[PDB]
């Protein structure tokens, strides 16, 4: 039954228009978000609500386990539209604890198409096999990998020529890593923010055009 969603929508739009009749009209003229959110599709991690933003504030990409790949035009086109056209000032890479995509990459079941999508998280589980091994429970291993994943994705975003070229032309842009607790509603900073070319390892730095 989808009628509740349509009924909800009418109520919501109507309510907003009563408080500010021009709300949507004004918003529709130009798109000017300061932030891009890159997060998981997980239904429990809705971008705007978690950081108290309004329609218009947050350009959003969500995919399984918030994975960023330099050959994926889907995520990359969102990044590029955000950085080049909208000139967002911040990219918020937000993973979450208890991520099922991350959990899947730690185990050995085939889930189908998603198996290949999660490869890079599986790579992370392998390079940190010794670290993860020294954690007693599965829940801890999942959650630590969730964090490691976010930090890796922050690196991946910051290494894109999209981001580096923004910096090259003097555009101000920071890439942040955060993690959301589905258990407590808390959006936490992993404090791995990258804001300039000088923070990249030499092997990843790209010269200007
Ligand atoms: Zn997830």
Q: Which residues contact 197 (CB under 8 A, 6 or more apart)?
A: 164, 167, 168, 205
Neighbour tally for 156: CB within 10 Å: 20
* Ligand 1: centre distance to CA 45 (Å): 8
| Residues labelled catalytic | 40, 42, 44, 96, 99
* Ligand 1: centre distance to CA 99 (Å): 4
- The structural domain count of the chain equals 1
Residues 88 and 35 sit within 8 Å (Cβ to Cβ): yes
Phi, psi of 187 (to 5 degrees): -95, 110
- Find the Cα–Cα–Cα–Cα dihedral 115, 120, 122, 123, rounded to 10°: 140
Task: Considering only the C-alpha atoms of the chain, give the largest distance between any 2 of them, rounded to a whole number of Å.
Answer: 58
CATH of residue 96: 3.40.1050.10
* Ligand 1: centre distance to CA 32 (Å): 27
- Given resolution (angstroms): 1.9
Domain that holds residue 181: 1-209
Return the sign of the alpha-carbon dihedral for residues 107, 113, 119, 120.
negative
């Amino acid at each position: 039954a989808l009628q509740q969603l349509f009924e909800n929508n009418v109520r919501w739009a109507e309510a907003i228009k009563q408080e500010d009749p021009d709300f949507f009209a004004k918003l529709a003229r130009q798109q000017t978000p300061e932030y891009l959110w890159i997060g998981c599709s997980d239904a429990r991690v809705p971008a705007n609500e978690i950081v108290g933003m309004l329609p218009g504030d947050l350009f959003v990409h969500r995919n399984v386990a918030n994975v960023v790949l330099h050959t994926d035009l889907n995520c990359l086109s969102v990044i590029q539209f955000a950085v080049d056209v909208l000139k967002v000032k911040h990219i918020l890479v937000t993973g979450h604890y208890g991520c099922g995509g991350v959990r899947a990459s730690l185990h050995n079941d085939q889930l189908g198409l998603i198996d290949g999508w999660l490869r890079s998280i599986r790579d992370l589980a392998y390079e940190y096999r010794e670290h993860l091994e020294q954690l007693p429970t599965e829940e801890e291993r999942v959650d630590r990998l969730c964090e490691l994943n976010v930090i890796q994705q922050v690196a991946n975003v910051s290494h894109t020529s999209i981001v580096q070229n923004a910096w090259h032309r003097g555009q101000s842009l920071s890439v942040h890593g955060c993690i959301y607790g589905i258990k407590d509603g808390l959006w936490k900073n992993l404090n791995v923010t990258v804001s300039g070319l000088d923070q990249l390892p030499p092997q990843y730095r790209l010269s200007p055009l």
